[PDB]
């Protein structure tokens, strides 16, 4: 009878799928670039990118939903990485930047719940969640470009702990 050293489901390999509602996808990207993207294919396209510390304003190219896109990015922090939520509202629309997370753990989260897509916002270790109203939130398809874990919404406090502390 030994004693084990929190409840984690994963890690899973990068993939495209229709995630279950009421679960966090805890994303663990290792390098700069696209982290996760998802759309309802009608009026909401969300892609989160990751920028390493110390990046002066520069135009970088990301494959967002299979399309080469030029995005001007910047990370004025010299110590933490920067996640940026990129949003468009049509299949060919232009992206705007939102709800960044400045991060030491380099972890991100997204969840389909209650009519919104929920992501994390702010600067670790003080990230909290906020949500984007998303038509047909429950049927959103997502692509993860990094290994990830699945956490039920009941364990959201644990997910938040991971976001904020690694
Ligand atoms: Na965010
Ligand atoms: Na994080
Ligand atoms: Na979900
Ligand atoms: Na809503
Ligand atoms: Na926390």
Automatic annotation (TrEMBL):
Top-level taxon in the UniProt lineage: Viruses
Site (Binding to sialic acid): 44, 133
Disulphides: 146-159
Region (Spike head): 8-166
Haemagglutinin outer capsid protein VP4 concanavalin-like domain span: 8-166
Cell location: Virion
Protein name: Outer capsid protein VP8*
Organism: Rotavirus A
Full-length numbering of the shown residues: 65 to 223 of 776
